[PDB]
Amino acid sequence: NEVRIYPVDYNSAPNEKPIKASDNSILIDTGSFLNTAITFDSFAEVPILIDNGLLAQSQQANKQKNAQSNLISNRINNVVNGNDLKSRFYDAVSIGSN
Amino acid sequence: QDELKHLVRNEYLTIEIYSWNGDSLLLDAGKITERTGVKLKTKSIIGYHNEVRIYPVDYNSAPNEKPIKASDNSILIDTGSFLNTAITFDSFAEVPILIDNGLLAQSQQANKQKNAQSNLISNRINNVVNGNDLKSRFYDAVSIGSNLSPTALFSKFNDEYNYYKELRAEYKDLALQPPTVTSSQMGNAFQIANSINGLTMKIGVPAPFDMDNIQRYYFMLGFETNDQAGTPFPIDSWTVCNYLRMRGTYTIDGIDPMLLEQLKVLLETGVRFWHNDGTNNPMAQNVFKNKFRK
Amino acid sequence: LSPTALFSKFNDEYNYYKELRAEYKDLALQPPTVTSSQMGNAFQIANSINGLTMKIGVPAPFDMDNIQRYYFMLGFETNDQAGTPFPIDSWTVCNYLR
């Protein structure tokens, strides 16, 4: 048992055509389509009579999840400075013998 | 068009081959020879242990490469990466078995964490050159001449050099968004539920306005080529704009030395030529119409 | 009595060529994939490639030309301390010295 919930029309450019079978069902929805989607797993579990049965839920909990939180910005490394414009303006006015 | 054949690069255009189990290939758009487009080849084992490995063909493979083969003529080692950068389809499926206390190997595989690269760094990040030196040299060259013109001369200078170094992208993106890496305990089962049990290719393209900006940039600024000791190619090549940036020891016949120095510095800064169109303002034209032959 | 234009005749390939230097050296063309099949070596036996494979990565001809031109024109770096410079007229055409 598993559920995967994904946004629709997300990061999908207009005019995109979603592939479908003869049934007309949308096999591949437009956009990320589970590339960035929530994965609901382990609907539940209850202790079972059989002993020595390792809980697969325990193993899944041992597995570590990783999720991004913030996005970096491109312009961090390179930033332009306006001192050049001030210098050019000063030179332009000064060269005029004003 | 031919002018934009170079536009097929990793950052601008993305092609992503996804196996919904969680594995991804993220083939970079570049290095795909125009001779043969994307052509995936699969090597598989089916039996006691089942596995598929799908790799691009003629990818990062220089021409004249010879692929080793046996007497059967089968290609044992295909040219290029050849599974060094390839998608690994595993766990075709699994169903619960009657035998109890049988640890699911699929569970152990899901516990194992997959790692896939998403973006490429750029070499020139740490070291970046600044054009202030050229401006200082030009100012010194003009001033040492005792020219009665004021410093406002240097004000007429234009500096797109720094702006266009700024516009350069720090990180190139192979895929539009990072690939998710989580393997379901059941395994491939989920894909079978929706009848999508197979590889899926998705193409990411820039928006039309960004594409227009990229086209304008490349048409106006030419293509970078750090050739050493090479004669500049014929200036009158493209119809409209032929950007050129030289830096070397040269002298035009019958030229005043100071004018030669000014021309040298100005070219080092980078000068754009607009071909005449028999109009009042040939400098203003539809750049997109620029074509290869003059 | 010459003006500052004298300094304009100066040439500065020093900064350009420090810029051209590579930040990261690459041992392999692309990063090696690290994933071990559960079966193990089995897969390689399927295609009869059960053994080591050596692959050689070489620069493209134009990049090779650029590298050759660079080294021929700029010599080889050697931070010798308190050493007499070697005979200038060694190579046929170009003998860069700093």
Author numbering:
A (entry chain Y): 344 to 441
B (entry chain Y): 295 to 588
C (entry chain Y): 442 to 539
Sentences from the paper on this structure:
Here, we report the structure of the complete virion of S. epidermidis–infecting phage Andhra, determined using high-resolution cryo–electron microscopy, allowing atomic modeling of 11 capsid and tail proteins. The overall structure of the Andhra virion follows that of other phages in this group, with an isometric head (capsid) around 500 Å in diameter (vertex to vertex), connected to a 400-Å-long, straight tail surrounded by 12 appendages.
Although the tail knob was expected to form a hexamer with C6 symmetry, it was inconsistently aligned relative to the RBPs, with two possible orientations, differing by a 30° rotation. The tail knob consists of a hollow cylinder, 145 Å long and 110 Å wide, and is made up of a hexamer of gp12. gp12 has a complex, intertwined structure that is similar to those of the gp9 tail knob protein of phage ϕ29 (45) and the streptococcal phage C1 major tail protein gp12 (46), to which it could be aligned with RMSD = 1.1 Å for 212 of the 588 residues. The N-terminal part of gp12 forms a β-sandwich domain related to tail tube proteins from many members of the Siphoviridae and Myoviridae bacteriophages, connected to an elongated β sheet domain at the bottom of the hexamer via an extended connecting loop. The polypeptide chain then returns to the top of the hexamer to complete the β sheet in the N-terminal domain. The focused reconstruction of the distal tail also resolved the hooks at the end of the β-hairpins of the tail stem protein (gp16) dodecamer that were not seen in the C6 reconstruction of the whole tail. Penetration of the membrane might cause the tail tip to fall apart, allowing the α helices of gp10 to disengage from the tail knob, leading to a conformational change in the internal α helices in the knob, similar to that described for ϕ29 (45).
